[PDB]
Paper text:
In this study, we used solution NMR to investigate the conformational states of small-molecule inhibitors bound to [name], an essential metalloamidase that catalyses the deacetylation of UDP-(3-O-acyl)-N-acetylglucosamine during the biosynthesis of lipid A in Gram-negative bacteria. We chose [name] [name] (AaLpxC) in the lipid A biosynthetic pathway for structural and dynamics investigation due to its exceptional thermostability, which has enabled both NMR measurements and crystallographic studies (for example, refs 13, 14, 15, 16). Pseudomonas aeruginosa [name] (PaLpxC) was exploited when co-crystal structures of the desired AaLpxC-inhibitor complexes could not be obtained. We show that these enzyme-bound inhibitors dynamically access alternative, minor conformations in solution in addition to the ligand state observed in the crystal structure.
Replacing the tail group of CHIR-090 with a substituted biphenyl diacetylene group generated [name]-011 with improved antibiotic activity due to minimization of vdW clashes with the substrate-binding passage. To provide a direct comparison with solution NMR investigations, we determined the crystal structure of AaLpxC in complex with [name]-011. This structure reveals a single conformation of the threonyl-hydroxamate head group in the active site, with the threonyl Cγ2 methyl group packing against an invariant phenylalanine residue (F180 in AaLpxC) and the Oγ1 hydroxyl group forming a hydrogen bond with the catalytically important lysine residue (K227 in AaLpxC). The threonyl side chain of the inhibitor features a trans configuration with a χ1 angle of 180°, a rotameric state that is less energetically favourable (7% population of all threonine side chains in proteins) compared with the alternative rotameric states of gauche- (χ1=−60°) and gauche+ (χ1=60°) collectively accounting for 92% of the observed threonine side-chain conformations. Since the observed ligand conformation in the crystal structure represents an unfavourable χ1 rotameric state of the threonyl head group, we investigated whether this group could access alternative ligand conformations in solution. Measurements of [name]-011 yielded a 3JNCγ2 coupling of 0.58±0.05 Hz and a 3JC'Cγ2 coupling of 0.77±0.04 Hz, corresponding to a predominant trans χ1 configuration with a population of 0.65±0.03. Such an observation is consistent with the ligand conformation in the AaLpxC/[name]-011 crystal structure. However, the measurements also revealed that the threonyl side chain of [name]-011 can readily access alternative, minor conformational states with a population of 0.23±0.03 for the gauche- χ1 conformation and a population of 0.12±0.01 for the gauche+ χ1 conformation.
Author numbering: 2 to 268
């Protein structure tokens, strides 16, 4: 495909899920060969694995004393639409969580895509690789198209679920909300996370119920969002990715570990 940017400045705002603090976000058009990067307090933070500063419950980027939390959702949308050249300006400490899914980002960007005139240099997975972490596992292997599978153990009514993204079904994961279990809420609050959490932006899961009045968006909404998360983290490779991925109980830390190992092997 051709490199892509946005045809005008796109604006978004809302609290961050973890900081609970309001952020103003502006997506700026950029020329060919610019890449995806964030901008905060006069500092450009490239959307690349080298700038990752934290990876639990979220993926956070940092550079020159400036930090931006929870970049995975907006990066996933950009990855799905193969937007390659924009600057994501942020006033605040965290990307807005909005409704907890990628819908608002996706709808606005898709509506304002500008095709540019240079072919995309894809990150193509060259060979099979497996990363593990005491039960957790992620495997990557060559594929000319992006395919991403996540399988999880939820230990509640959801049980064991899996979902597979293939190119063409991008919109089957952009509505999947971020989620939390009721048994981890106390811990989340204690370590200073989830301060922006509410039923308006988070799917809250119980043992045999959903705390959200409207219930689930999909019968397998959580694993859909996990795929959505992985695609976001995968874009930290610096280019749109072509490969086949399988994640079992993976998280941001394991996602970034795979990214870093893939980057090292193909540099
Ligand atoms: C799922 C993960 O991959 C990951 N999500 C999180 O880490 C996460 C952690 C905690 C919350 C929360 C909350 C709340 C609440 C609340 C509000 C009101 C009442 N009355 C009671 C509870 C949300 C997301 C993620 O998507 N990363 O991209
Ligand atoms: Zn997420």
């Amino acid at each position: 495909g051709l490199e892509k940017t946005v045809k005008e400045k796109l604006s978004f705002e809302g609290v961050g899920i973890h900081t609970g603090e309001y952020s103003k976000l502006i997506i700026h058009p950029e020329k060919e060969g610019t890449g995806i990067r964030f901008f905060k307090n006069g500092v450009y933070i490239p959307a690349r694995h080298e700038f990752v500063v934290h990876t639990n419950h979220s993926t956070d980027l940092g550079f020159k004393g400036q930090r931006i939390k929870t970049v995975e959702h907006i990066l996933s949308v950009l990855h799905l639409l193969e937007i390659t050249n924009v600057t994501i300006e942020v006033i605040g400490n965290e990307i807005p969580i909005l409704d907890g899914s990628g819908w608002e980002f996706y709808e606005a960007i898709r509506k304002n895509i500008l095709n540019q005139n240079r072919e995309i240099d894809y990150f193509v997975v060259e060979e099979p690789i497996i990363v593990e972490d005491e039960g957790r596992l992620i495997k990557a292997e060559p594929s000319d198209t992006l395919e991403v599978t996540y399988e999880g153990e939820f230990k509640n009514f959801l049980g064991r679920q899996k979902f597979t993204f293939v190119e063409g079904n991008e919109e089957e994961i952009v509505l999947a909300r971020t989620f939390a279990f009721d048994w981890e809420i106390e811990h989340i609050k204690k370590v200073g996370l989830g301060k922006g959490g509410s039923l308006k932006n988070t799917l809250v899961l119980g043992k045999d119920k959903v705390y959200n009045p409207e219930g689930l968006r999909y019968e397998n909404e959580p694993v859909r969002h996990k795929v959505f998360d992985l695609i976001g983290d995968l874009y930290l490779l610096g280019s749109p990715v072509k490969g086949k991925f399988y994640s079992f109980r993976g998280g941001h830390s394991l996602n970034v570990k795979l990214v870093k190992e893939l980057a090292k092997k193909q540099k």
